[PDB]
């Protein structure tokens with residue numbers, strides 16, 4: 170079966186054969202589409218086919234499919250599975266695996282960079298302090314004084330599901346959120362529940378608007394422990410505007426390193442529940458969602474007042490007007506401080522090219538339109554006009570429950 | 581099987597049961613989602629009629645009544661006899677209002693029950709069609725106080741006698757390809773503008789020429805008619821800040837009227853069913869004006885605002901886009917022509933969703949189309965999970981007439 174997708178701005182039509190290799194399910198059926206839905210222990214029984222499928226891919230990519238090296242490896246893994254009920258990836262397979270999980274992440278607009286990924290192997294890690302050290306080295310490496318480099322650190326895989334390694338933070342670097350008695354919120358409202366856990370676990374919160382959260386790290390299924398990332402490793406950027414000099418007085422800043430720490434990496438049926446990764450920001454992640462979402466810092470009003478916009482009628486488009494200036498401020502500040510950042514035009518144009526390339530060389534590129542299209546100025550970026558097919562390939566990054574809902578506390 | 585939708589801005593959860601009535605197919609599978617793809621006999625007929633009549637009678641609280649049973653019989657008899665059947669006016673109105681109600685891509689459905697339905701099933705000729713459309717235009721425009729309407733021409737018989745309006749909208753500007761290589765007017769209409777000429781139109785080769793109507797009746801060859809100018813309400817576009825804006829020469833029309841869709845009610849097919857509402861500002865300002873394959877005016881407006889167009893990172897496209905849309909809304913409001921902004925419209929849709937979940941058990945919605953083409957995440961619908969599925973009665977796409985017409 171072949172499937173065609175069309176760009177309605179250019180008439181470019183592409184054909185997808187890659188989707189045939191999709192094993193996992195979408196959430197959709199023939200009768201219902203769940204394309205806008207946010208969220209729609211393993212036996213030796215099912216593991217070897219998963220291993221084999223992965224190893225077949227890997228050996229295909231290195232042009233050694235069917236080789237003695239390939240056959241010996243399948244044999245080796247098989248034996249290790251029945252002998253030990255799991256198996257260990259080689260370094261080469263781990264690296265390939267991580268790169269491909271990124272490559273397959275249909276919700277990531279940054280995938281043109283997929284092949285340049287620094288993979289840190291932390292599978293020898295045994296304790297939380299061990300985890301802290303690895304994470305520090307990641308932040309410092311990835312930050313690179315503002316010249317950001319993509320990186321992932323991979324802690325040991327799941328065994329019985331009772332010995333999981335987990336980073337409890339959703340991102341390595343994030344600001345604290347504090348619910349006040351008057352019901353208002355100080356800092357980032359998205360982080361209120363997690364900030365509370367930290368305080369309870371002993372964190373002394375400065376109780377400000379931009380407090381870098383501590384790391385809460387769980388190793389080997391034990392209770393998580395707290396660590397403060399050395400401030401000198403946390404690159405931040407004060408936000409100012411190129412024309413509005415009152416903008417700096419809003420007291421806004423953000424961190425330079427966007428690093429996701431709550432996902433699960435699946436490779437060959439192995440489950441890596443602690444696999445923090447980082448790239449660099451598309452400006453709208455900060456300027457639109459982080460600053461302007463009603464349920465985040467929500468600075469649209471304050472910025473609008475200061476701009477002297479007509480805020481009496483929505484049809485003045487005061488919100489839209491302020492939104493643009495804020496996103497200009499973000500891009501300006503980051504570029505001025507020589508911290509890597511990409512605007513949503515540059516990023517989406519690059520993704521289209523990436524995508525077209527992926528159709529030629531690979532037969533497809535799974536992509537989630539709902540997430541690929543930027544949260545402002547959608548139709549004046551080329552991805553809006555691009556039909557996309559969403560499906561799930563492995564290796565992949567998956568969601569997993571927040572560990573505070575699942576953890577069995579030792580005490 | 582009982583699905584939940586979450587709003588991630590408000591944490592509100594609604595439960596969807598209505599999807600368990602969906603009959604038609606989505607294009608998606610369990611292996612692959614096609615949510616962003618634009619276009620994914622007597623024995624056939626009676627169950628279709630039955631499903632419809634059942635819901636119609638259920639809606640009027642006479643489910644399983646004698647009237648219900650009788651009608652069911654009567655229609656069954658007619659189909660068995662004539663191979664087709666005819667709707668009672670009451671059914672027709674219901675069907676059309678419900679086609680709208682079920683239109684998953686339409687943000688304006690809170691209005692769904694206030695739809696003027698014009699029964700034009702007695703129409704026989706293209707002139708007759710022209711008369712009905714002018715009447716529709718005048719009624720719906722209403723000197724700028726727009727009112728929703730649909731006019732419904734006779735249903736398909738044997739597909740040889742289809743009524744079709746060839747235009748995609750009752751009111752659109754012409755598009756001409758130049759020796760220059762560039763395009764004058766509306767590029768989306770370049771081809772249609774051609775078939776107008778090839779069939780007889782005397783194009784004034786302007787930038788904003790209201791296209792003629794190309795009406796096909798009873799499967800016959802289609803004919804041209806010029807809508808009376810005084811019935812086409814237009815709005816000159818000015819900005820409440822930039823005096824230079826007027827000098828761009830921009831205007832748009834007030835009446836947004838889709839004419840190329842197929843209305844399906846109880847198995848019957850209405851291939852000519854033009855309908856109209858009123859514009860959401862972004863349809864004109866973002867899409868019509870700023871799409872590359874449309875009027876593509878961003879570069880010009882940017883130059884006029886004197887922005888640094890050297891780097892994409894200055895967000896000059898974004899800055900211009902907002903101003904343009906401010907202008908669009910300003911102009912319509914100034915001339916008292918109904919228009920709604922993306923904020924109010926989406927706010928209203930969220931409300932309509934809450935009502936539809938509460939009074940009907942769901943509301944099919946296509947997030948890809950409901951979220952506006954600008955400022956997406958600062959409208960509430962961005963943060964709203966939506967389930968998409970096809971209920972009937974429905975509006976469906978259908979092939980462009982020139983690719984099907986037996987000349």
Ligand code: HEM
Nearest residue numbers: 271274276277278279282319320446447448449450451566
């Ligand atoms: C290098 C620059 C990168 C850019 C500009 C970029 C861009 C983005 C953006 C804008 C999102 C949407 C985030 C959201 O709205 O929640 C995203 C999501 C995602 N990215 Fe990237 N990305 C980059 C690097 C990476 C890397 C290095 C990885 C993994 C190795 C990755 C994997 C993912 C995944 C798995 C998601 C989905 C996360 C979720 O579902 O919550 N990206 N990316």
Ligand code: HEM
Nearest residue numbers: 680683685686687688691728729855856857858859860975
């Ligand atoms: C009265 C106020 C109305 C508003 C504000 C409104 C809004 C919209 C918008 C913004 C779209 C997207 C169109 C596009 O991007 O191409 C749309 C599409 C649509 N609307 Fe409405 N609409 C209104 C009235 C109506 C009426 C009266 C009907 C039918 C009786 C209707 C049925 C539809 C359908 C079927 C579509 C999808 C058209 C397509 O797929 O090309 N709408 N509407």
Ligand SMILES: c1cncc(CCCNCCc2ccnc(-n3ccnc3)n2)c1
Nearest residue numbers: 207277340427428429446447448449588
């Ligand atoms: C559900 C509901 N409401 C909100 C959410 C947030 C999803 C988080 N997506 C990841 C966002 C993020 C942050 C930092 N970096 C990156 N990142 C890094 C590389 N690629 C993406 N992504 C989920």
Ligand SMILES: c1cncc(CCCNCCc2ccnc(-n3ccnc3)n2)c1
Nearest residue numbers: 618619686749836837838855856857858
């Ligand atoms: C599929 C594939 N390639 C291109 C298209 C264009 C879709 C046009 N949709 C209708 C746009 C429109 C115009 C005027 N009025 C209205 N309208 C009126 C009431 N509701 C919507 N919609 C569809």
Ligand SMILES: C[C@H](O)[C@H](O)[C@H]1CNc2nc(N)[nH]c(=O)c2N1
Nearest residue numbers: 205206207539540962963964965
């Ligand atoms: C309900 C809807 O799917 C949800 O708000 C999505 C929409 N698109 C998104 N797109 C990105 N990039 N990130 C997001 O968090 C979301 N949220």
Ligand SMILES: C[C@H](O)[C@H](O)[C@H]1CNc2nc(N)[nH]c(=O)c2N1
Nearest residue numbers: 553554555556616617618948949
């Ligand atoms: C490929 C994609 O489906 C296409 O660009 C869609 C996106 N969303 C849309 N949304 C609306 N309201 N109207 C459109 O024409 C489109 N086009």
Ligand SMILES: [Zn+2]
Nearest residue numbers: 197202608613
């Ligand atoms: Zn789908």
